[PDB]
Design a protein around this nucleic acid. Structure first.
Lengths: 333, 333, 333, 333
DNA sequence: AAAAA
DNA sequence: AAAAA
DNA sequence: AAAAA
DNA sequence: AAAAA
């Protein structure tokens, strides 16, 4: 049995598996992997999988394969390889991808209902912010999934440009990251959740940068607004990266306590080395100005240590901004 | 085939498509758009759409048309025009409105399950806070959808008044905005979410104003309470508008940092111009009073700069109120 | 046709409609209300309602009636009266109660899927924290629904006591209020949501008081712990009531601003009347100590106004605790 | 009728009921408990339960029993005992476990849709973070369920180690606790929710400790990083335990107020005893330094009470960190 | 909100 | 985003 | 997590 | 909470 090659592969030039020279026909699989461990140019229909309560597919190297239909029955893909595979036009229910590798494969126009991706590798994968639906899905490695995807730009036709494709893919990734995080609120390990928070913050700021770059490329008012937007996105990248690196992205109060103690110790050492204060109260002055409740007792304009005191207060204010949300997260769920 | 014209069009005077002189009969469509690009006075039944996995409806100008039934099969409306169209008494599942224009069309008594409205224009549309159900719907342009709707008041009968209709539509829009935001928590781009936050805050405050105006119009205790409620809603409009304009409605920490820096710079310039302070520590005094930790070192009642110092402290307090929730939002998801 | 009277009515002495002398048989309704506007001792089965897409039941006075089955078809109850009615053993889907009155009626062992109660009156109704399921339900008047319910205690058998029944009903109401609030996050008007917040806070604290009273009634260590728990619940009742009355239960920043301004004005008037300070800077001292950033400039132990200054600072601290969550709610959704 | 013993019992050595010497065959139950109150080595299929709207199973002592299938019909287990029972390969819908005891029983590969566990005892139970699905489940005793589970280690084969099994079970419990909390947001009593918050915080920190211990056991850079991670997890355990014990894990503002008042009173008593300050303003100095707004009026480096004042300020700062989230929780839902 | 496949 | 079982 | 109606 | 289509 054979079936027509899909327009997603042969016409949609934005797709990772796009091949204008793809064969007109694909073999229709009977889902028998005993004879061939690597299927090629094959269509895997949900109506043709064997009658089983759980189908375990193990160590199969898929290349240039298509999936189609409503996969209601449970499937376990164990250490499978997908290369230029199209999962589009399919609805998987409770499908488990365990240790699988995805290369140049597309998840656009796909529904993954209550599925799981665990210990998977992604490179040059593709998804859609609205047409890659992941209801109750568990992506155990959110950062690798999100940033293992990238827009394919070698088949961009004339009249369209590479840069807009990439910079709109940034927003696409931001949107799907929002969806993935909302999934992970119910589900997954703490580490998976916090990796997802990291990924979604980074993707949101990258999308802001990309949209500002678009507005710049595309009248002087628009150029000024795009430049200001780009600077603003750059600045928010920097601050958010510093804060999340310093507090584990809202996970660990202990790390924030430790950076606070390190900063206080450094300021106290500077007090002791430069202004001849004994350590046992240079530490006290440092923690007194750091937490800002004892600032006015030591700050006097025109004094030698005034700039140092003001810097210590600013460090304390930044540390407050870092530390308060960690406590809020650990105490409010 | 023909069907009776619906009471929603011929009797419900609150509906946008209400026409007491509407024809008694509507033509029943066979959903063939090859011959006629604009259908008129036509009923589109979900039971009569052609057998297709996805029906693409492109460049069709609907006017005075009704939809009815359970549209389970996927429909894509591409650049269609709906004028005085009734979507009521229908349940659409995974319907995509792409680039469509809605004029004087009603979404009351409608269910939109997992639907999408993208790049759409709305004007004089109508919806219901409880009978326009949008489960998992994605409205890509929340502000335009919400504020493109307005109560129809030309057919209000005697004994009812225009003002109450409009001012209860304000609360209606607030309720549906709440629903739309709850949808967008799972879904959509960051920009769509933040536009929805803007729209729902504005709609909530407009509904408060409208209900206060009703309580005024409808005994001296009630008038006093309505007037106080109206002033309170006005005041909350003003503060919420200022704060959300100043922080991107809880989106961008960088903008709040920039307004803080601008305010500090202005106060420091005033210090330098008026009280002869060098810039390199007029800036320091300004940031010292702005963040409030160095207020008492410079504030003295009866001094020339005392009012300026007090204003700088008040500006800093407002800036704290502006900036803290932005950090909370960017660090807590 | 006739059916056996249910054990919920004749045996379950905790139910509001409990009647040990109830007739052995109930008439089985054919759902024809044209002849009789008030049905009595009648069983309304979901399998026997007439074939209709939406059944409108208007101005029907139900008394001692039972409902049973899966009411999949839409029902609209318009201005109906339910007296000692059992909705138990039923699953209603998209049922609308509009302007209905419930007296001594039970919602235990009932599922209300996507239902709506609007403009309804409740008195002596009954529900269960776990067996009254309200998935996606909209209760437009949460406070009246929750506090219109109360445990029936006249049929408590020997060996059980009235007090435990009532004080465990307090926890029951708290649990169902939690469920109702979680519903209203997606849905309903702002006013309904904030009334639900009020109701659920009050119910949680009443349940704490009731459980402490139980632990007291039911060894000296247990009595001490119950007494301490009761005092703690009393104290949290008081503070939560004051804060929510002062800020609209987290709704309106303007009201909190206004109580802040009133308190500052009162303290400033006291300054001006007692310590001879001109108003134009008694106001400034009051706002300087209220926001706590200028406290140490005016506070000196042993001074005449020291107690007043300390009170002004305490008022400011309480006002901070009142006002910060209102800003958080209005800026973070 | 008889059926083959499942590989979960005879092969999966990580399961609590694992018995390599289990009989090859299990009796297939007809679900008649009138004759035998304790079934042994019996398979309970969902297809073979008697035709009933609600099946009440009361006072049945199950031992070495298996459940299998889609239990769509409602089941009430009342005071039943499960010993080495496998609920795996089953999907229960609206199953109520009331007063049941679970010993060495497994919930892996199980779906519990809208189920309820009330007044149950758990010891040596087993579950999976991803394969124990609890959609809309209500676990009335979250702490006992979560910490009544533990990895079975006596059947660990050669080449695998006990320690890794236990320390990965810690993360497993953390993940399922996250799921249980997300369930309890919609549902259950306040006490159940707050017990779940306690359990999930403790489990998250235990999992952090366990993963750090793994990274230590499994090059000097990795050892240093594991040791630092272990110290960080220890520290966060300590702080989170202190804060949640001091504020009821975000439940009760009154308890936080009371610890604040106790600390202030202790510091004031120390002032009065050591530095001869009258009580009526030793209390005022204590509350003035505790809330930090009056710190600089009393703090002077080199004074006798300077260390005490600094300690009082630190106590106040910790109390702020304790108390603010309680107010946030009680005012923001 | 009403209306009512 | 597009596409379209 | 594994396992696999 | 109990109860039990």
């Amino acid at each position: 049995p054979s079936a027509a090659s899909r327009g997603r592969r042969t016409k949609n030039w934005w797709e990772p598996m796009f091949d204008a020279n793809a064969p007109a026909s694909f073999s229709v699989s009977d889902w028998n992997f005993s004879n061939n461990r690597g299927p090629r140019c094959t269509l895997f229909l949900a109506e043709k999988m064997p009658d089983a309560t759980t189908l375990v597919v193990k160590d199969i190297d898929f290349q240039d394969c298509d999936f189609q239909g409503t996969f209601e029955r449970k499937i376990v893909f164990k250490d499978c390889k997908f290369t230029r595979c199209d999962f589009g036009l399919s609805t998987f229910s409770r499908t488990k991808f365990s240790g699988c590798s995805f290369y140049a494969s597309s998840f656009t126009q796909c529904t993954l209902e209550n599925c799981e991706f665990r210990n998977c590798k992604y490179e040059k994968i593709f998804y859609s912010g609205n047409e890659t639906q992941i209801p109750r899905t568990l992506i155990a490695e959110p950062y690798q999934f999100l940033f293992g995807a990238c827009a394919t730009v070698d088949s961009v036709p004339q009249g369209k440009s590479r840069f807009e494709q990439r910079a709109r893919f940034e927003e696409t990734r931001s949107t799907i990251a929002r969806a993935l995080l909302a999934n992970l609120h119910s589900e997954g390990s703490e580490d998976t959740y916090y990796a997802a928070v990291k990924a979604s913050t980074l993707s949101e700021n990258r999308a802001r940068i990309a949209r500002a770059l678009i507005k710049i490329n595309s009248r002087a008012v628009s150029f000024l607004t795009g430049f200001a937007s780009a600077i603003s996105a750059v600045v928010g990248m920097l601050i958010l990266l510093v804060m999340g690196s310093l507090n584990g992205w809202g996970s660990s109060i202990s790390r924030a306590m430790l950076v606070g103690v390190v900063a206080i110790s450094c300021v106290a050492y500077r007090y002791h080395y430069r202004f001849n204060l004994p350590p046992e109260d240079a530490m006290v002055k440092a923690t007194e100005i750091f937490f800002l409740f004892g600032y006015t007792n030591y700050a006097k304009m025109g004094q030698e240590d005034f700039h140092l005191v003001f810097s210590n207060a600013l460090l304390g204010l930044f540390w407050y901004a870092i530390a308060i949300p960690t406590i809020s997260n650990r105490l409010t769920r």
